Amino acid sequence: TEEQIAEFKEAFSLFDKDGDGTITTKELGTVMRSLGQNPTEAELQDMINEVDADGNGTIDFPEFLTMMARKMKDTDSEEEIREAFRVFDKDGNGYISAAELRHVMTNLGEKLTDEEVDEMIREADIDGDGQVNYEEFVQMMTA
Amino acid sequence: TEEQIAEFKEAFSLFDKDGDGTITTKELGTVMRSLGQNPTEAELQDMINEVDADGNGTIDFPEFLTMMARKMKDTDSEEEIREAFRVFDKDGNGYISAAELRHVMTNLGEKLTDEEVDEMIREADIDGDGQVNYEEFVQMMTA
Amino acid sequence: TEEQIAEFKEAFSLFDKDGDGTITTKELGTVMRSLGQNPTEAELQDMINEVDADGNGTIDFPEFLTMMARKMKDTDSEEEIREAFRVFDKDGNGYISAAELRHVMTNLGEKLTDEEVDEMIREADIDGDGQVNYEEFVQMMTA
Amino acid sequence: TEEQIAEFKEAFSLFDKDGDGTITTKELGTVMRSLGQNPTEAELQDMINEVDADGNGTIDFPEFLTMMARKMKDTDSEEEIREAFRVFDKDGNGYISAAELRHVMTNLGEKLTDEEVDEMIREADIDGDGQVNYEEFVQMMTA
Amino acid sequence: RNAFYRKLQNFLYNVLERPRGWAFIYHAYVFLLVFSCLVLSVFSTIKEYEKSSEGALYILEIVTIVVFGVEYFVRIWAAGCCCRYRGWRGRLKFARKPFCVIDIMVLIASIAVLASALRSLRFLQILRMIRMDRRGGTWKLLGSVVYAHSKELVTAWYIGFLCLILASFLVYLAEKGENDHFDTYADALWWGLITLTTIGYGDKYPQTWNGRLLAATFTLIGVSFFALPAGILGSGFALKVQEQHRQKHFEKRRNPAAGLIQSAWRFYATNLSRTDLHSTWQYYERTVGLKVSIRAVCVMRFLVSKRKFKESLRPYDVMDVIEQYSAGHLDMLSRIKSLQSRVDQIVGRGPAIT
Amino acid sequence: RNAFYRKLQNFLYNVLERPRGWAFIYHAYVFLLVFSCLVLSVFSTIKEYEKSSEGALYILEIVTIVVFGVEYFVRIWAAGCCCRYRGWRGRLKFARKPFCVIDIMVLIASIAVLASALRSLRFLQILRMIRMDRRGGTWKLLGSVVYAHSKELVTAWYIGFLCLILASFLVYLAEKGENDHFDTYADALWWGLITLTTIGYGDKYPQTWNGRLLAATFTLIGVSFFALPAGILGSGFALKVQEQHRQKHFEKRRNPAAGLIQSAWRFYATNLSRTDLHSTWQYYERTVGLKVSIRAVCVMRFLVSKRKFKESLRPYDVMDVIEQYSAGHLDMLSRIKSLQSRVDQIVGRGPAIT
Amino acid sequence: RNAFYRKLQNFLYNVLERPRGWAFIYHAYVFLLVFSCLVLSVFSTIKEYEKSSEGALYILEIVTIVVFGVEYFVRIWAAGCCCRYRGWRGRLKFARKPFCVIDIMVLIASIAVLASALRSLRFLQILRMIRMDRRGGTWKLLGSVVYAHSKELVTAWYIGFLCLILASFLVYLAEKGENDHFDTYADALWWGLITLTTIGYGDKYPQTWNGRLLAATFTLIGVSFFALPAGILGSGFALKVQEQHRQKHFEKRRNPAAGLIQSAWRFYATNLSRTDLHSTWQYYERTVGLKVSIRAVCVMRFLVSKRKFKESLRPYDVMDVIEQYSAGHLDMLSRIKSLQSRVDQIVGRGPAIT
Amino acid sequence: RNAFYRKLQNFLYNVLERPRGWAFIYHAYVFLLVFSCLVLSVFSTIKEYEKSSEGALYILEIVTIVVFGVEYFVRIWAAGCCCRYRGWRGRLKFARKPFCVIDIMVLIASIAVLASALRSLRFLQILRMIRMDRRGGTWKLLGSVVYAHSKELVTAWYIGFLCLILASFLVYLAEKGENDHFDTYADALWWGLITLTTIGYGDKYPQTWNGRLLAATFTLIGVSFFALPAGILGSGFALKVQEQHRQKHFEKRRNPAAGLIQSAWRFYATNLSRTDLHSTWQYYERTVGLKVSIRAVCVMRFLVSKRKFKESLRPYDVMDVIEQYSAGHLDMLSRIKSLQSRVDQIVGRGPAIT
Ligand SMILES: C#CCN(Cc1ccc(F)cc1)c1cc(C)c(NC(=O)OC)c(C)c1
Ligand SMILES: C#CCN(Cc1ccc(F)cc1)c1cc(C)c(NC(=O)OC)c(C)c1
């Protein structure tokens, strides 16, 4: 909406420091390390290419507002999350014990902090069982 | 229910001789050999682990009542029993002759007695054909 | 029905010359060669076994009437006929040219006569195309 | 209809220069090169065989009118077009960037002209995105 | 009698042509007799044993030649069984085949020799041994395997030939003067071939240390690449036998499909209630209460044919099950599409009834 | 005591028959003892070392013969464990087995020799070494592989035999006079066999350049085809081992299927509310508040059996998963057919309610 | 004429570059001529046959050099056919390729030698033989196979090298003094290599019994591991050829996909009723009652293209059919999801109409 | 500095431990240096070249020993990088590993010898060459292949051993007196081993014609079965490498699964509208208008992670796709079951509204 458009303009200005309406991979990297994380030049390239649609090496505002407006539903992440949890499901039972998440979530890839995994179990342990089912869990993520 | 929970407590006391609220593997083995069967220790670990949910090597009463209350339907034994009988179905016709059950049931794994196989055919030979179809049999077991 | 049962008894007597109520493999073979065809003793054993349900090498009248009464619908020949015609369908188009039937029908296995193949095309060429769809053909056979 | 039948008669006369009611392979080739394209004799044989139903090497008018009347719906091109675009979908995302069509469509097999690809993108870029989904695209060919 | 004569002619033709059972043992025995004749020829070539060797060889060879003559005679005579060739003209036309030509030239050469002889006798032994196959099955398999793996064999041969040439030339340069084994490049190339094949007779070998080192470094690769083709051919033989078995399985499927379709039509055309079925009953009447009996026989045949065809639909392969299930899955897709259309119709009626 | 005696008899029978664990090591050790006896016989045949070799050989052979005698004794005695053979009559009936006959003739021959001797002793060593297998497993595997790949082996043998014969004859013609290695065709054939096998002793080799050239061209193909059968047999060994493992996996599936069905019936037949179940409770009572405990133990058994059977349904192969999923897909087809019927009923009612 | 000149230039370029049919036979013939030149060089190196050998060699080599020169000339001249290189400048730019550099340096070396010579002539024979490949296809395949199975080859080489070193050293220790074959560790290592490779020249072998025993125990393993790499490479060759065939199959799929899409669009853009289609009719008009003829031709083209593409969708592999069917199954999942949402809508209306 | 020191310590530990890129070249170079040291030792053992060989060997060995010492020092020092071992105590604890024990005893033996010497030096060369592997990867692969194919190898060894024993004994009987090669059974056994392996030195071979014939008939089978194990091991090597690649692929899948789950949770926990999300925003704040930027970067990370994980779900195998699709088919079965229940509800309502 109009207010969302204004917020997206604020975000674009925060990113597009030059104010040319196209986010530079260097601008993105600078803001990223301002947030406290260093990417790789190739990593930023893949990110932008993922969001890029005009094949220009930058993002015009239409693409940016599309990216903000793209809710996870149109992304269709159901099958991907199902498959990932299945990969981490060593039993095939359709569930997974809490300790396995506490370990892997915090020791693989972009390791997550204690608070994040705590809210993870909070929203996943709706039944308070610990042996959370990943299938229903991705369903609840979707909704 | 309340009467069910009272019966559950009676059973738990019958198992948890110590009365500490946690069934020990040795308590379970003792009661079993009282019933007249000798398991293996490792077998006891496997079963207790199957019912275990707190990763403690024992069962507090909540897990025990969940174990009793788990009706076969929530167990979802349809596909497994289908596959087992299919394994014992050498034709793929979807049926199996009575004599095959009379033989294998009484000579494989935990061999069953004559009475058990007789009631088996009774509840499976609803059509009185002998060439019982395992598919409808597992469905009727479910219901 | 009752009149059907009387015809069934007439047929059984025609086969069971001894009148003992059990059709012998030799009785079946004798009648068969009376109709003008020579089977093999093993072939007769296979057929009797197919119809046999008591594992006796013969057929009591209940089995005989069950066998006659078995309409093709319950036989579940849809899949088998689909698969056979598909085997003879060298294209996978879902149809088959008339000449192909005229040849294979009359040159493979129990070769059929001209009249049989003519009525075959009659009931298959409902559209009068010749490139009969075997799938629709088995569907109409079932009904 | 009657007027369509008259138009098909005009087409047949344009093809069947002899006017014998059967389009010869050479008549088809002559007209084809008149339109400005040379086939191969084997190629013409393949086409005639495709349309041929009487196994005569030519086409009587009934087959010709059936050929004209055959709308793409009954042809069932959904799966085939889907699979082709999938083959050209190097990502499996379910879409394809415009430049890929601009290149391959004009450089593979029967290369088409600029205007053809332009109307292609016109009827494909109904959303005006360029990353047209081939699935919806074949669907709207169907309709 | 005459019918029995034709039956025996057909059986003899089958035995002499591709056999299945005991005719296989008869062919094994005739091959064994030829092999023993060849062994006796070998022993005849030996001097100290020549006496008894030739004494037995003459009689074994007379037995072999009479067997060959009578076998060709009966083969020509039974050639009339097949519909392709019938009568004396048909038998001669069959005899025009190149294989029969080979057999007859061999026979006449043998009879001429019997009625420098060792050279011709040994040659003719070899040609009859070649003729033993009778179908080129081994040769066809070998050729098919070679053609299928043409690229691997060609690359192996090219690399190994380069290795042989290079190693031979380098060793020859290294051992031109010092060693008398390699006085000429031809000798060096013979050494290279005998080494890379790993035969290693030992009549020629490098002795100069530079030559020894070059030979080591090159014959490693050389022996590897000379061994390659054997393994390639073994794998190809396995693959081609698998493919042939697959084709045989699918033909064994093809015939019961016809059997099942025939029986199914006949039974569907023997229903008592349905009319216009006399076109089927007439066949059985020509073969000849009786109507119900005929229906019983026909349905019995249909069920047995159904079972035989079903057990003929063995997987035998992942591809087979995948294909059958994919046909079923296309059927399922069509069914769900029809049900989609039906629910579309229901929702469209929704407005009508709402 | 007596029950313990029967238990030990069964354990001894299992050890002496196909073992699994430490009995495998015992068999390895007895084989090693026989192997050392053979090695010491080898050293005895050596002259300069004959003294100590025979000195140790006598005692090692006495140990071997006593071990063989006692092993056969205990095998016969424990033969009574199996239900097939029981009692002294049963043990004799087992002793009638051909393998026991082999072992006993070996034993008596050894004892007769102990109480021209080297010939018999070495023969006996070879026969006992043969006997070591105890199951023909290696022989059965080899025979099965040969039969399965009969066509590839036969074509390889035919082609290689033709190559051997032709190369030997051509070289013999080329080297008949010039070279004294090939004075007779038998010598040429021996050379051909020693060359195509790549043994290349070096006692015979062509020297005439035409002979050398012919030999090269023919031994290329010859060595390829003589190496073929080794690779064919290796591949066949791998394939047959895979198939045997598949069968063992399926039997390991077969037993837990019975276990699960038994436990599931018992638990379904131990429901407290349901009646007429005494036919099941009676079994546990014979094994012997208690009713709920019986239900608990029975359901626990059912769940453990379920998990065990499920883990026993490992894929292990594409064919396996495809078959299981195809059974599921047929079930799904039936379900969708039922739902098609339901929508047909609904659309038929539509007119009734419209 | 000029158009015919360009057509013949393209034909000659295709023939000289990767050919398909009769140009393959021409390349076979030029290779055979080079091979015969090499054979004549071999015979020239022989002394007793030197006269006629060199007499024929000189003329065959003049033929070879003229053929090489004219072939390179034609290749350079036809290099203008390809759009990459055109004109004299384009032909020179193509000549800048390294392969053309090899060919031209070989040509000039030959012309210099013709107008110690044996060394250079044999060398140049070897380099031309190398050059025969013209695409490095064999070399690329061999390198790809080596890289793919790098681990198996490396483990085999490591184990075999350890076996060679250890066995040679142990035998050298055992046979240092007694046998004069192993006077130095270098000789022992040469023996180890010649043995583990199974070449077994026979010029060196152990004679001390301890040495013989050590050699036996080590060369068992040594020959096994020296034979390994040949089998590994054979299997890798088979695998890589299979993968290349798969890729070629998928490109043969890729092109008909474009053909079908083109024809389908054109036919969909030739519908008589639909307007705005002139963008397609104009193309056929430029190629040039007529409208219906154009529609008929276009739909005919579409149907033939559809058929060709469908037969281009052969399974060729389990993975292939699984991929296509899994795509279809994803569409099926989407359709059933849509039907789930639709029946959800129906049940939600239920309350509305109840 | 200190942080840079730890970074360089970790880099050095990675280089010295299992490397990936240029450290691979460094290890190749150190191995090449050791190999050249061994070659110079070989040349030193040669007499005529002993002078310069030893002259270069001494300096190359000093280089080798200093490199070994410094490399072990650096490995021990960098052992502190890993969390398992830190500090001087941690480095000593790492040094307690058996492999470091091998390295240190080798180092001290070399330094003692440097500061009958040829025997020890050559031994030390062999042990260091063994040490080159640094991971037992080749040994682990070989052992795993042997264990996996234990049955094929055991049957091949048994059959080949029987063939060797039997053929040697039969030839010894046939050639006991006439030929002086086989004066003892030990000589006959050595001949049998040298023949069945196809080494064929030529120092021993049959000459009696009965002996020659027996040897031919038995060495056919013998060479086949002695060649078997090489092919078996080659196939097993290929299979085990394939399985290891499969496992590596699945771990490469395992990590991106965690990456995607992490990013998906973070993005789902960065929704602007949703509350109670501060538990996630705080992480980014700790890393540090800004809220929308945080959401944007988080969703960007999620999308890139999704693309990478999806690309990580390559089939790689028929089993893989079949497993994934069978899981999906289970979901499809559940969905159709739910829709069956919903239609059951609708048809149950039918009576209510009818
Ligand atoms: C190829 C070829 C040669 N032949 C055929 C042949 C037939 C008769 C002969 F007198 C000589 C040779 C051959 C080759 C091998 C390796 C073997 N050994 C074997 O199969 O081991 C598994 C045999 C048993 C025969
Ligand atoms: C077949 C056969 C012969 N045998 C068995 C045998 C057992 C005891 C002996 F004293 C002699 C031979 C045999 C053959 C080979 C190739 C090897 N080498 C190997 O496996 O490398 C992988 C071995 C280790 C044994």
Decide: F and D in contact? Rule: 3+ Cβ pairs under 8 Å.
no
CB contact (8 A) between residue E292 and residue C32: no
* Gap between the Cα atoms of B46 and F301, Å rounded: 11
Is D103 an 8 Å CB contact of chain A? no
* Sign of the CA dihedral with F132 first, then F135, F140, and F141 last: negative
Breaks (C-N over 2.5 A) in chain C follow: none
In a shared domain, residues C58 and C84: no
* Gap between the Cα atoms of H128 and H107, Å rounded: 9
Nearest Cα to F337, choosing from C84, H239, H132, H340?
H340
Is F352 an 8 Å CB contact of chain G? no
In a shared domain, residues A67 and A9: yes
* Tokens 């608070």 found at: A115
What is the tally of helices (H) and strands (E) in chain A? 9, 0
Indicate the DSSP class of residue A111: P
Give alpha helix (H) positions in chain G: 2-16, 22-45, 50-78, 87-95, 98-114, 117-131, 137-148, 150-174, 185-196, 209-268, 278-287, 290-312, 318-353
Structure tokens at H310: 């999806």
Chain C residues closer than 8 Å to E331 by CB: 82, 135
Answer yes or no: are the C-beta atoms of E313 and E257 closer than 8 Å: no
In a shared domain, residues D55 and D99: no
What type of residue is A17? K
Query: Which residues, 6+ apart, have CB-to-CB distance to H133 below 8 Å?
Result: G158, H139
* Tokens 């208008």 found at: H289
Chain A residues closer than 8 Å to H279 by CB: 115-116, 118-119
* Gap between the Cα atoms of G38 and G44, Å rounded: 10
Query: What Cα–Cα distance (Å) separates residue H132 from each residue in G332, H31, H101, H127, H185?
Result: 56, 7, 14, 9, 42
Beta carbon of H225 within 6 Å of any ligand 2 atom: yes
Query: Which residues, 6+ apart, have CB-to-CB distance to B86 below 8 Å?
Result: B92, B134, F327
**In this complex, how many residue pairs, one in chain E and one in chain G, have their CB atoms less than 8 Å apart?**
144
B46-78 burial, b if ≥16 CB within 10 A, otherwise e? ebbeebbbeeeebbbeebbbebbeeebeebebb
Which of A27, A50, A74 terminates a domain? The answer is A74
Decide: B and G in contact? Rule: 3+ Cβ pairs under 8 Å.
no
Cβ–Cβ contacts within 10 Å for residue B99, how many? 10
* Gap between the Cα atoms of G241 and F134, Å rounded: 44
Answer yes or no: are the C-beta atoms of H31 and H37 closer than 8 Å: no
Answer yes or no: are the C-beta atoms of F121 and F41 closer than 8 Å: yes
Nearest Cα to G206, choosing from H55, E145, A65, H203?
H203
Is E341 an 8 Å CB contact of chain G? no
Give the length of chain C: 143
- SS3 (DSSP) at G316: coil
- SS3 (DSSP) at H179: coil
Indicate the DSSP class of residue C105: T
In a shared domain, residues D4 and D67: yes
G100-118 burial, b if ≥16 CB within 10 A, otherwise e? beebeebbeebeeeeeeee
For residue D34, the domain's CATH number is 1.10.238.10
Angle between helices D78-88 and G290-312 (to 10 degrees): 70
Distance between the two ends of chain G, CA-based, in angstroms? 86
What type of residue is H214? L
Query: Which residues, 6+ apart, have CB-to-CB distance to G74 below 8 Å?
Result: G12, G16
What type of residue is B59? I
Q: Give the annotated binding-site residues of B for Ca(2+).
A: 16, 18, 20, 22, 27, 52, 54, 56, 58, 63, 89, 91, 93, 95, 100, 125, 127, 129, 131, 136
Answer yes or no: are the C-beta atoms of H90 and H80 closer than 8 Å: yes
Q: Whose CA is nearest to atom 25 of ligand 1?
A: F157
What type of residue is G18? R
* Gap between the Cα atoms of G134 and G136, Å rounded: 6
Interface test with H, best of E178, E195, E209, E223 (most H CBs within 10 A): E209
CB contact (8 A) between residue G287 and residue D80: no
* Dihedral pair phi/psi, residue E15, rounded to 5°: -60, -50
Indicate the DSSP class of residue F181: G
Q: Please report all neighbours of F, defined by 3+ CB atom pairs within 8 A.
A: B, E, G, H
Structure tokens at F6: 């029967």
Quick one: which ligand is closest to H231's CA? 2
* Gap between the Cα atoms of H145 and H140, Å rounded: 9
A132 has which bridge partners? A96
Give alpha helix (H) positions in D16-133: 25-35, 41-51, 61-69, 72-75, 78-88, 98-104, 114-124
In a shared domain, residues A69 and A91: no
In a shared domain, residues D70 and D19: yes
Instruction: For chain B, give the DSSP string.
Output: -HHHHHHHHHHHHHH-TT-SSS--HHHHHHHHHHHT----HHHHHHHHHHH--SSSSS--HHHHHHHHH--HHHHT-HHHHHHHHHHH-SS-SS-B-HHHHHHHTTTSSSPPPHHHHHHHHHHH-SSS-SSB-HHHHHHHHH-
* Gap between the Cα atoms of F345 and F352, Å rounded: 11
Distance between the two ends of chain A, CA-based, in angstroms? 21
Answer yes or no: are the C-beta atoms of G91 and G77 closer than 8 Å: yes
CB-nearest to G262 from D36, D82, D105 is D105
Instruction: For G256-274, give the DSSP string.
Output: HHHHHHHHHHHHHT--SSS
Nearest Cα to B11, choosing from F300, F275, F283?
F300
Query: Which residues, 6+ apart, have CB-to-CB distance to B76 below 8 Å?
Result: none
Between vectors from CA B83 to CA B78 and to CA B86, what angle results, nearest 5°? 125
Domain count for chain C:
2
What type of residue is E110? S
What type of residue is G259? G
Structure tokens at H97: 């590993």
Query: Which residues, 6+ apart, have CB-to-CB distance to H185 below 8 Å?
Result: F41, F42, F45, F46, F122, H168, H169, H172
CB contact (8 A) between residue F142 and residue H155: yes
Answer yes or no: are the C-beta atoms of F256 and F312 closer than 8 Å: yes
Query: What Cα–Cα distance (Å) separates residue E118 from each residue in B116, E121, F182?
Result: 84, 5, 16
Q: Determination method here?
A: cryo-EM
For A76, name the nearest residue in chain D, comparing CA atoms only.
D93
Query: What value does the CA radius of gyration of chain D take, rounded to a whole number of Å?
Result: 19
A96 has which bridge partners? A132
User: A52 CA to middle of ligand 1, Å?
Assistant: 68
Answer yes or no: are the C-beta atoms of E58 and E74 closer than 8 Å: no
Nearest Cα to E33, choosing from E59, E70, E72, E15?
E59
* Gap between the Cα atoms of E257 and E255, Å rounded: 5
Answer yes or no: are the C-beta atoms of A68 and A128 closer than 8 Å: no
Query: What Cα–Cα distance (Å) separates residue F219 from each residue in E193, E196, E240?
Result: 10, 12, 25
* Dihedral pair phi/psi, residue G59, rounded to 5°: -70, -40
Instruction: For F35-70, give the DSSP string.
Output: HHHHHHHHHHHSSTTHHHHHHHHHHHHHHHHHHHHH
In a shared domain, residues B88 and B33: no
E179-217 burial, b if ≥16 CB within 10 A, otherwise e? bebbbbbbbbbbbbbbbbbbbbbbbbbbebbebbebbbe
CB contact (8 A) between residue C35 and residue E300: no
* Dihedral pair phi/psi, residue E249, rounded to 5°: -60, -45
In a shared domain, residues C63 and C109: no
User: B64 CA to middle of ligand 2, Å?
Assistant: 59
Nearest Cα to H277, choosing from A136, A116, A125?
A116
What torsion, rounded to 10 degrees, do the Cα atoms H250, H252, H254, H259 define?
Answer: -160
For G148, counting Cβ atoms within 10 Å of its Cβ (0-12 exposed, 13-18 middle, 19+ buried), the class is middle
Structure tokens at H101: 């024990």
- SS3 (DSSP) at D96: strand
Interface test with E, best of G120, G187, G197 (most E CBs within 10 A): G197
Answer yes or no: are the C-beta atoms of E329 and F329 closer than 8 Å: yes
Angle between helices H278-287 and H290-312 (to 10 degrees): 90
User: G224 CA to middle of ligand 2, Å?
Assistant: 9
Is H232 an 8 Å CB contact of chain E? no
* Tokens 């036969």 found at: F154
What type of residue is E103? D
In a shared domain, residues D11 and D42: yes
- Long-range contacts for H308-312 (Cβ within 8 Å, ≥24 apart)? H308/H256, H308/H259, H308/H260, H309/A80, H309/A84, H309/H256, H309/H257, H309/H259, H309/H260, H310/A80, H312/H252, H312/H253, H312/H256
Decide: E and H in contact? Rule: 3+ Cβ pairs under 8 Å.
yes
Query: Which residues, 6+ apart, have CB-to-CB distance to E313 below 8 Å?
Result: C83, E253, E324
Query: What Cα–Cα distance (Å) separates residue E338 from each residue in F76, F336, F341, F351?
Result: 72, 11, 12, 19
Instruction: For G44-76, give the DSSP string.
Output: HHSSTTHHHHHHHHHHHHHHHHHHHHHHHHHHH
Which of B49, B74, B99 terminates a domain? The answer is B74
* Gap between the Cα atoms of C26 and C15, Å rounded: 10
B132 has which bridge partners? B96
Nearest Cα to F61, choosing from F39, F76, F88, F83?
F39
- SS3 (DSSP) at G101: helix
In a shared domain, residues B69 and B108: no
What type of residue is H62? I
Beta carbon of H190 within 6 Å of any ligand 2 atom: no
Answer yes or no: are the C-beta atoms of H164 and G196 closer than 8 Å: no
**Residue C26 structural domain:** 1-74
Three-class DSSP labels, chain E: CHHHHHHHHHHHHHHHCCCCCHHHHHHHHHHHHHHHHHHHHHHHHCCCCHHHHHHHHHHHHHHHHHHHHHHHHHHHHHCCCCCCCCHHHHHHHHHCCHHHHHHHHHHHHHHHHHCCHHHHHHHHHHHHHHHCCCCCHHHHHHHHHHHHCHHHHHHHHHHHHHHHHHHHHHHHHHCCCCCHHHCCHHHHHHHHHHHHCCCCCCCCCCCCHHHHHHHHHHHHHHHHHHHHHHHHHHHHHHHHHHHHHHHHHHHHHHHHHHHHHHHHHHHHCCCCCCCCCHHHHHHHHHHCCHHHHHHHHHHHHHHHHHHHHHHHCCCCCHHHHHHHHHHHHHHHHHHHHHHHHHHHHHHHHHHHHC
Between vectors from CA B117 to CA B113 and to CA B118, what angle results, nearest 5°? 110
Answer yes or no: are the C-beta atoms of B80 and F306 closer than 8 Å: yes
Chain A residues closer than 8 Å to D130 by CB: 53
Query: What Cα–Cα distance (Å) separates residue C110 from each residue in C113, E255, E258, F224, G209?
Result: 10, 10, 8, 48, 75
Structure tokens at H104: 């240190």
In a shared domain, residues D131 and D121: yes
- Long-range contacts for D3-11 (Cβ within 8 Å, ≥24 apart)? D4/D68, D4/D69, D5/D65, D7/G292, D8/D61, D8/D64, D8/D65, D8/D68, D8/G292, D9/D61, D10/G289, D10/G292, D11/D64, D11/D68, D11/G289, D11/G292, D11/G293, D11/G296
Is F247 an 8 Å CB contact of chain E? no
In a shared domain, residues A53 and A104: no
Is F197 an 8 Å CB contact of chain G? no
Answer yes or no: are the C-beta atoms of E177 and G160 closer than 8 Å: no
Beta carbon of F161 within 6 Å of any ligand 1 atom: yes
Q: Which atom of ligand 1 is nearest to the CA of F233?
A: 22
For G186, name the nearest residue in chain H, comparing CA atoms only.
H42
Angle between helices B78-88 and F209-268 (to 10 degrees): 120
Q: Resolution of this PDB entry, in A?
A: 3.3
Query: Which residues, 6+ apart, have CB-to-CB distance to F272 below 8 Å?
Result: F291, F292, F295
Structure tokens at H145: 């292949």
- SS3 (DSSP) at C132: strand
For D107, name the nearest residue in chain G, comparing CA atoms only.
G258
